[PDB]
Design a protein around this ligand. Structure first.
Ligand code: ANP
Ligand code: ANP
Ligand code: ANP
Ligand code: MG
Ligand code: MG
Ligand code: MG
Lengths: 493, 493, 493
């Protein structure tokens, strides 16, 4: 039952230890981390929420910041490490002010006012985009993709085929990513079924594919096992074994050349498909189901649906221009669908470790693209944080009293992300920080930032280094929620 | 939770320990290794990915390298030991550069640049093949086959019968290999069922074989057990017990003399076959099924398929010129199929251990054959790597900065496989290295290498010592990818 | 029984771990280290040989480098950390060359030639001093004193009172240092007895002190306890109790006002001294004895010496102008002695920890002063090492063959001390290293070094930053002896 100041200590320390760890991954010069499970498994990543999640972090405070990261990821998908470092800074500063005797009440008030002002400036200064072709969107994607231009171009190009889906606040663009070992990273103008067909004789290409999709399995209508002791029961078994074979005949009459199922397939049916040139894939994902349904313009059927007359069934079929089973990667690719258009961002690499990290990078980039398209952009490099820092310090006195301390803490904490990245890039973090602030004021350009390889100060938006607006809004908001939440803590059980 | 430089050590150390072990297997003068199971089993091999797999690899880094090896094996099937050694070299070199104070970031940048240049040069210089007969294909097969010209001739001859199949990026030539103790290494122009027939009276030869093959078992159409309490149910048990017998008569009328099944056989049928001299094999592999299907031109049937008219059944039969059951080796050989032609590369030896290793060698040779046919060849003996080192060191200058160090590390690392193979062959590795590099430049022949037997420098391509191109590309790509990914690691949990 | 390469590893690693630790203490921006004994004791220091000595370092290699440091300290007293870092560099480089396949023989040869050339250049380029007043001597003292100018001035000033003693290769100037808690650091133109007198009535000052010094105790000539059973024995006891009291009377007649003893004092004598105004100090060090003997011009006596006639005794007395017992610090100070002149460099601080570290600094400075006075000076900052580095790399080919590698290693290792200090000063170590080397060649001034606070390149000798020549000679020589000694190692038991 730790209490008093030795609660606030026990907390703050617990957070520092956490943030220190991911601090090394923040930025373009950030380094990776290697994690192993309690009993032998291994991941390597630069992703923040990943690192923070996989260490089983035992202190409650640490677990809370981890949850904050999770939240940040859920909201936008990037800016996790930023949120962590920022949170840590906020907390440490808050503690510092509190130890010097500043009332918690006041620290929290100042921090809140600061927060609201900050978010205000962030929403206000967001520079919005009109296109999807705008180089600022692709730039956002590149920065989030950690410098991969190929991937950024791929995602822009896919989003282009969508856009409408971006209008729904529930469409995660990264859902389009699909990772496959031994693949080559590329854009597929169709959907992928990541499974081998029921019968394979090597790689295979299909053209003018009329397909039938089932959220069922291709079995006859069943008769409960008990009921088979009852003549009529059995006669029903026979009857709908007959109507079943008739239905398969319907399938051939309609010219079906592909069948996808979410369940299994009868032996009789399997034979029918083999003899009549029909390809089958079983056990498809629900996700896969939805996407192929949309793309091919097919309607989802159950076994009973095959009892429709043939004229009514042709209406449930879908169409794809081509369809290709890759014997080397063991999946199937449907392209040229008669329904909505869509894409699959295929991410390839040699080994599991690498394709995993590349998928994470991909999804980061996708989310940040979408986030940019939805919310506009801002100058990256952490500069806009510095703008926010002086603007927040502006508020130091607009309410006089001890809330000032609180405000200062917030301002000072906003200085930290940048400093870290500069330190990560081998520079004198503090020096570059100060210099850049002075310069920002003197040329009045709050978009001036640091080029981390060359070491020269540049114009960030000019340099193609932009962050999505919502990523910053969300990062600051979440980091703030957790830090303020922790600072109000006085006792532990 | 080890961090900082003392992560980079524990990683690097863990890797050297691994690579050292397989280094002695690299080359034509490389030596073998012996491995034992947790509870009594034994392997002997010169193969890299195998040794690396069977080892107790506990460290995360080592496990990552094993995984890389696995990837290299998946991709091309040869060149694993090379990839391991190269990877290790890259890592140690990188560590050294980082220790003299080069920023990790810069090292990795330089290495990436080097990598890309290397791959470019590798692809550019690939020497293409235009025939399945080219003496360079057989050369590749010989070298990968560790000097065995018998096997190489067999694979050339076998690959020849296909050609149509190699065109599929999913066709593993090595899938043709089959190992049998007490056999003699030979080319079989058919497919083998590695099983004894259901009824054997000693070795037996069949000619003019009309055969029927089933992805089922030869049983009557079943009736669920419960339903038998229901008159109609039983009456149909009877009815399609009669229909089964008449179907067998159909088999006799068609003159079927061989039956292959992936499931079992009813006793009634087994008697039918005994009395009408029809040979039967049960429980065949999926491989065996697909192969015999393609080769005999038969169509796969299920029990229900025997209900067609006799005239219709005659269409799914297949035909083989001859068919021979070997009582000594206890398998069956189908030759002269009316379908596509194919081959079985039979690999024989006295003991389990040896035929296992000879099989590994065979598959390696097949894979390098196919890969040569697909991607061309390059000068082996480790020479082309020296050319690439000489070429990569070039960039040190063409881009200024500290990336140079990184590039140097890459350059210096490509030097290692050769030096290892030379030391393994009992030469002064460093001397031969220097001499050979100097010479390579002076005669401008980027293909001069060391004959590890004679000790004289020869032209490797003229000397018939060639590596498949894709094997080199994949090896460099993979070793690089893993080393770079490990060097970016800064912390371990 | 570790053997082969895994001896050379086990060694090299063991050394790295050691050197890393003291590397942080090297330089003007070096930081301190805290050590605790197996059972609760504590030291804080920047001294190298101290840090290295106090960790109980378990690996044989580590223990050897520690011994090397000890040696360096014995020889000159400064340059310990330099020697350690240099040794480490030499070893790591040597290992690197050896792993690439360079014959140990050759590495060692190259390193030796390099060593001899280096020492040659060091002896050749030593810039000698003529004075003792030369600002280059005081500069040497300041640099060694870690920037304390007060102390440097003190030591120069004392050495001035000696100089003759410096002519003997056996006089350690640092022997003049005396550390006292609660004292004030100052030069005393006399000698100090660090003990309280036999009888104290508070602080006390004596003038015109005629003193008697005894390497004995003031007791009568003894009679063995057995002998006291023998009349004549006892009569001898009486007799030389009588002649003893007479001798004390001689002591008063001669006007003795102070007596120093290395042993004890009789009760009768103690009374005699109390009643006749005579101060006594008992149990003085041998060191203290020698110094006060020299300074006061007294001759050492034993009890029997008091049997001389008075006229002959006056000849054994010594004289001091003044003599002062400080009741606050509890020691005694003799000044204005009629013998040789001498000094006591009194080092004061508040606490044990601090006065200890300050004594270490003092002795460092004293030794480096003396070393400068005896052997001349060189440009510090590690620059002269860089001169030596290019000069050593000069030798790379003057013998062609693989010794070249060895030579290079030596050269490259000489680059390391500087780099470390630059890294310690928060700079980019590698960058500053390279820049400075280029500049050194371009302005041809091999005395150009780095100002570690300002960050600008300056002329070192001009900047007052000089090392004693012998400190460098010794550092390089010793570091080399141990590194070469370790590299010849192939097996461990
Ligand atoms: N080339 C660049 N120049 C300057 N800043 C950059 C550059 N690339 C990325 N950044 C900045 O790096 C930060 C993002 O680093 P990153 O490693 O993604 O942390 P994070 O995105 O906050 N957490 P996460 O991406 O989920 O791992 C942002 O502040 C970017 O502005
Ligand atoms: N006769 C030869 N002369 C010179 N080099 C040869 C000769 N035979 C093979 N090599 C080289 O030896 C290497 C093959 O060694 P090997 O032991 O197969 O390693 P690996 O093939 O890379 N790994 P793995 O085959 O999976 O066990 C290649 O670099 C060949 O170029
Ligand atoms: N102001 C300075 N500017 C430049 N170099 C300096 C300065 N002060 C000291 N040095 C260098 O610092 C080194 C000595 O550092 P130091 O910490 O004494 O290590 P060390 O003397 O080799 N071992 P030790 O002195 O026994 O602890 C020498 O190379 C000096 O040239
Ligand atoms: Mg990011
Ligand atoms: Mg091979
Ligand atoms: Mg010193």
């Amino acid at each position: 039952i730790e209490e008093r100041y030795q609660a606030l200590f026990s907390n703050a320390a617990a957070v520092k230890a956490l943030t220190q760890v991911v601090a090394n991954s923040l930025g373009p010069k950030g380094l990776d981390a290697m994690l192993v499970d309690r009993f032998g498994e291994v991941v390597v990543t630069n992703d923040g929420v990943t690192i923070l999640t996989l260490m089983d972090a035992q202190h409650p405070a640490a677990r809370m910041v981890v949850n904050m990261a999770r939240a940040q990821e859920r909201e936008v998908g990037d800016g996790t490490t930023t949120a962590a470092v920022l949170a840590g800074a906020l907390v440490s500063e808050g503690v510092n002010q509190i130890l010097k005797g500043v009332p918690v009440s006041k620290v929290l008030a100042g921090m809140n006012r600061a927060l609201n002002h900050a978010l205000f400036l962030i929403r206000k200064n967001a520079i919005k985009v009109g296109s999807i072709t705008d180089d600022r969107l692709l730039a956002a994607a590149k920065i989030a993709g950690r410098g991969d231009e190929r991937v950024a171009a791929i995602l822009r190009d896919a989003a282009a085929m969508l856009e409408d889906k971006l209008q729904d606040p529930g469409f995660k663009l990264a859902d389009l990513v699909l990772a496959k070992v031994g693949a080559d990273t590329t854009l597929i103008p169709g959907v992928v079924i990541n499974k081998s067909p029921l019968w394979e004789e090597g790689s295979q290409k299909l053209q003018e594919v009329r397909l039938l999709v089932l959220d069922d399995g291709l079995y006859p209508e069943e008769v409960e096992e008990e009921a088979l002791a009852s003549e009529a029961g059995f006669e029903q078994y026979l009857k709908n074994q007959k109507i079943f074979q008739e239905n398969l005949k319907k399938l051939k009459e309609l010219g079906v050349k592909l069948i996808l199922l979410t369940r299994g397939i009868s032996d009789i049916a399997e034979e029918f498909c083999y003899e009549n040139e029909i390809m089958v894939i079983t056990r498809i994902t629900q996700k896969e189901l939805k996407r192929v349904l949309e793309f091919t313009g097919a309607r989802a059927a159950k076994r009973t649906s095959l009892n429709k007359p043939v004229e009514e069934l042709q209406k449930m079929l879908g169409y794809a221009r081509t369809c290709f089973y890759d014997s080397r990667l063991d999946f199937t690719i449907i392209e040229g669908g008669a329904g909505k258009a869509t894409a699959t961002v295929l991410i390839g690499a040699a080994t599991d470790e690498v394709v995993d990290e590349q998928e994470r990078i991909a999804k980061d980039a996708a989310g940040s693209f979408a986030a940019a398209y939805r919310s506009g952009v801002l100058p990256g490099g952490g500069a806009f944080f510095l703008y926010l820092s002086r603007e927040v310090e502006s508020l130091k006195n607009r309410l006089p009293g001890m809330e000032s301390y609180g405000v200062m803490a917030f301002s000072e904490a906003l200085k930290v992300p940048f400093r870290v990245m500069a330190e990560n890039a081998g520079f004198n973090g503090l020096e570059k920080l100060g210099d850049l602030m002075t310069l920002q004021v003197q040329k009045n350009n709050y978009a001036l930032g640091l080029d981390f390889e060359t070491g020269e100060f540049i114009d960030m938006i000019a340099g193609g280094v932009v962050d999505p607006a919502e990523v910053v809004y969300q990062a600051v908001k979440n980091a703030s929620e957790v830090a303020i939440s922790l600072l109000k803590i006085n006792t532990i059980i």
